[PDB]
């Protein structure tokens, strides 16, 4: 139940960013739909990008 | 055994703009780098960041490399958006940070540090479990 946590490891980091990019280049994964619009697409990737750059 | 990520150093006088490199080593040994994010701290009363630019080891930096700086933290995010074809495969400079030096009354060395957070992915985007991080600094000499 942790948004952005692609590989379910308790961290939201570059590994998740890469996993999301691969995913979109290839279904519905709830914790990857970070804007809750019932799609996982490049908008979710862009949101995760901005999050990672603003995190700390 | 581990990916080395090292912040280097620089020096100058108040008002100078200096370049601090961020270097990767043992890249091939760790199966290349496909993605990474990390966070550096600096003293914002002594340094202001002017720019952050990808180094020679990053291919297609305009697409694959991003950074942001705010109030004492610099963020970095790299991803090979081709997944297989623009990996970091060589040892060398990953990024160059340009800081403008602020005023000091006596010669001072101030740290540029790794803050907690982020991860490094190898050439298959799998976690690199051992990353040896070395903090850097800037020396301001009035
Ligand atoms: Ca994760
Ligand atoms: Ca979405």
Curated annotation (Swiss-Prot), chain A:
Residues 1-56 form the Dockerin domain. The C-terminus (AA 411-475) may play a role in organizing the cellulosome complex. The biological conversion of cellulose to glucose generally requires three types of hydrolytic enzymes: (1) Endoglucanases which cut internal beta-1,4-glucosidic bonds; (2) Exocellobiohydrolases that cut the disaccharide cellobiose from the non-reducing end of the cellulose polymer chain; (3) Beta-1,4-glucosidases which hydrolyze the cellobiose and other short cello-oligosaccharides to glucose. Belongs to the glycosyl hydrolase 5 (cellulase A) family. This is Endoglucanase A. The chain holds residues 411 to 469 of 475 of the full protein.
